[PDB]
Structures are given as structure tokens and as C-alpha cells.
Amino acid sequence: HHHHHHMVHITLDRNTANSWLIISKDRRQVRMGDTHQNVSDNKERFSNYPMVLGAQRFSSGKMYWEVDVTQKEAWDLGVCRDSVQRKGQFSLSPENGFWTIWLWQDSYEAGTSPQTTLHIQVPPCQIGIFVDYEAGVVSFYNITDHGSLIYTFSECVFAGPLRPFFNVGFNYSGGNAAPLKLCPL
Ligand SMILES: CNC(=O)c1ccc(S(N)(=O)=O)cc1
């Protein structure tokens, strides 16, 4: 892919974070804390899952960013509507306003309804995410494997402004404490 030149500087929005997340000073890294993090509750925070949004909102154009997932066992990445549900249980699907992939139990899957099996030969340490708003496309690239395509959502019905979306995952196993990091341009 030649999407690198639509690179955007993404930062995390503290106010949307689950109350157990720890966002770095530079707002470029997030990890699961071992407790509640001593913040007030608000209507933006994801309550049920270790999720956070980017601060940036996109309503046009082409955008590209990269995320480091080194040594994590579980995570979700992609984009979502600004108006997605924050409280209670929900599935990651385009019907609910999410365009995402994930790692879970040693398999990679795209967040379609129902979920789609991904075929990745080289486990990624960094993921590239490309959004073309006008085309209705969200694509995922394996930066560890020379940028190889992972998955393309096409004919997307965004139906609103988009935000970068992150889930660091739970750490029941003790093997999933590592952060998500936004990689430098
Ligand atoms: C409301 N959150 C929880 O009940 C919760 C919070 C943290 C964990 S972990 N991943 O073991 O650190 C599990 C569950």
C-alpha cells in the first residue's frame, strides 16, 4: 500500500476511557491498570470493556495511522461512529457503528456480524489502519509483513463522524498487560 502519505497524528481522549485505563502524558499509549484509576464517571466512558477513543473526528478525506500491539494476547482496533453506545453490553459490528479487527485466543477476526476469520501468516507487531470516508472503506495492513493486506470493509455506511477506536483487552491471564501505542510517522 501507498497510504503512508495520508498519515494523521492520533491522540487518545482520556474522557472516553474506561476508568481502569492509564493513558500516557503524551496521549499516545494506553494500558490496563490493576485497579480503578481514581477518575470521576461520565456519560462518555466505556463502562463494560477496556475501550477508549481517539480525540480526532473524521467526516471526509483519507486518513492513515499505525498501532503497536507487541506481546498482547487480546485487543480490538479500528474506527467507530462518534455516537456508539458507551454503557452496557454490545457487539462490535457495522450495525452498531464499529469497523474493527481483533486478536482473541490465538485467532484474528474481523468484526462483521457474524465475525470473519482472518488469514495472517506473520503475527503482526504493528497494524496500519486506513479510512477513505468518501469511498466508504476501512482497511487494515500488517506492518510486520511489508504492509500486507489483512482485511477491507467496503460499502461502509458510516452515518456520522468517525473516531479512532481501541480496546486494550482484559488481563485475566497476566499475559496481556502490554500497552497499545500509536507509532510515530
Ligand atoms: C468492572 N470491571 C471488572 O469487573 C474487571 C476489572 C478488571 C479486570 S482484570 N482484567 O482482571 O484486571 C477484570 C474485571
User: For residues 43 and 115, what is the distance between their CA atoms, to the nearest angstrom?
Assistant: 28
Q: Which of 92, 99, 88, 73 is nearest to 151 (CA)?
A: 99
Phi first, then psi, for residue 112 (nearest 5°) are -85, 175
Q: Tell me the CA–centroid distance for residue 170 and ligand 1, in Å.
A: 7
Experimental technique for the deposited model: X-ray
Q: Concatenate the DSSP letters of all residues of the chain into one string.
A: ---GGGB----B-GGGS-TTEEE-TTSSEEEE-SS--S----TTS-SSSSEEEBS--BSSSEEEEEEE-TT-S-EEEEEEETT---SS----SGGGTEEEEEEETTEEEE--SS-EE---SS--SEEEEEEETTTTEEEEEEGGGTTEEEEEE-S----S-EEEEEE----SSSS--PPEEEPP-
Question: Could you tell me if the CB of 172 is within 6 A of ligand 1?
Answer: yes
Label residue 92 exposed, middle or buried (CB < 10 Å: 0-12, 13-18, 19+).
buried
Q: What angle do CA 51, 54, 56 make, to 5 degrees?
A: 155
67, 129 Cβ separation under 8 angstroms: yes
The C-alpha cell at 56 is 480526532
125, 137 Cβ separation under 8 angstroms: no
Residue type, 19: S
The C-alpha cell at 77 is 482496533
Question: Could you tell me if the CB of 49 is within 6 A of ligand 1?
Answer: no
Superfamily of 4-182 according to CATH: SPRY domain (2.60.120.920)
CA distances from 39 to 17, 18, 51, 115, 179 (A): 10, 10, 15, 34, 20
User: For residues 46 and 119, what is the distance between their CA atoms, to the nearest angstrom?
Assistant: 30
Question: Could you tell me if the CB of 38 is within 6 A of ligand 1?
Answer: no
For 65-79, letters b (16+ CB in 10 Å) and e give: bbbbbeebbbbbbbb
User: Which amino acid residue places its CA nearest to atom 1 of ligand 1?
Assistant: 48
User: For residues 121 and 112, what is the distance between their CA atoms, to the nearest angstrom?
Assistant: 21
State the resolution, in angstroms: 1.3
* Cis, peptide link before residue 114, omega less than 30° from 0: yes
User: For residues 38 and 21, what is the distance between their CA atoms, to the nearest angstrom?
Assistant: 10
Q: What are the CB-based long-range contacts (under 8 Å, 24+) for 151-154?
A: 151/101, 151/110, 151/116, 151/118, 153/94, 153/99, 153/110, 153/112
CA 6 to chain centre: 18
The C-alpha cell at 126 is 504493528
